[PDB]
């Protein structure tokens, strides 16, 4: 591979890791770095924004532990009134509904914390402070976790304004997952217009934006004038 192809391969893997579903090793790495950045930044509103962001991610981590424990406790129950196939499926559907409703509440609490993290960053008014790598790192982490929290629950239309705000920050526009999620969420919205028989202007708006971010994600991962880039361009043209 060339120096650009090797660099690109390395970067796509780092970006896929960046958007990895949360776990304990990523949590530890993320917050230890954010606290070191907070000490460098020495800004009380950034400190508060981080305290809230961490509380939001903690809500998510608490839920992941709850879901495993809940499913475990249910698995260990004896079901005496489960003689029929429809009884087994019904009980399964009831389990999934309880899990989804609890995940929905955890998402709502996590987004209230993320909203507070943003409201504190909003209080940093000095343009020299809003341009801080520390400011941009935290703001990117808040939006990324916010996008993922909604994405997991299939709340794709809600991810669009946050993905858009995300890609405007510190070259995030060059991230392949960011364009993949935008393209998928736009695709969902296009399908909503087709299913609900909505207006043509919105059909084409959503289709257009899907194709822009589909092609851009392709360009970023495979490169300009790659068999894959040429293919997507030829489908669009």
């Amino acid at each position: 591979l060339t120096e650009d192809q090797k660099k690109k391969k390395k970067e796509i893997m780092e970006q896929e890791s960046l958007w990895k579903n949360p776990d304990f090793k990523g949590y530890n790495k993320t917050f230890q770095e954010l606290h070191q950045l907070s000490k460098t930044f020495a800004n009380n509103q950034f400190r508060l924004a981080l305290s809230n962001y961490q509380s939001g991610v903690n809500t998510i981590m608490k839920n992941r532990d709850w879901v495993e424990q809940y499913r475990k406790e249910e698995a260990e129950k004896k079901r005496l009134d489960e003689k029929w196939y429809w009884q087994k499926v019904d009980r399964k559907a009831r389990e999934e509904r309880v899990v989804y409703r609890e995940k929905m509440k955890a998402k709502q609490d996590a987004l209230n914390y993320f909203s507070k993290a943003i409201n504190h960053l909003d209080e940093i008014k000095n343009p020299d402070l809003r341009e801080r790598p520390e400011f941009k790192r935290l703001l990117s982490d808040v939006y990324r976790s916010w996008i993922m929290a909604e994405y997991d629950l299939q709340n794709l239309p809600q991810t669009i304004p946050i993905l858009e705000l995300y890609i405007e920050i510190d070259d995030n526009e060059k991230e392949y997952p960011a364009h993949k999620y935008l393209a998928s969420a736009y695709s969902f919205e296009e399908n909503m217009i087709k299913k609900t028989k909505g207006p043509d202007d919105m059909l084409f708006k959503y289709r257009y934006k899907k194709n822009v971010h589909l092609l851009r994600a392709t360009e970023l991962k495979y490169g300009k004038d790659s068999p894959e880039y040429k293919h997507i361009v030829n489908v669009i043209n």
Binding site: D128, E131, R132, P133, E134, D170, D171
Partner: peptide, 12 residues
């Protein structure tokens, strides 16, 4: 501070 300003200019 001016450190961030320097990094921003370099990235640009």
């Amino acid at each position: 501070s001016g450190k961030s300003m320097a990094d921003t200019e370099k990235e640009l």
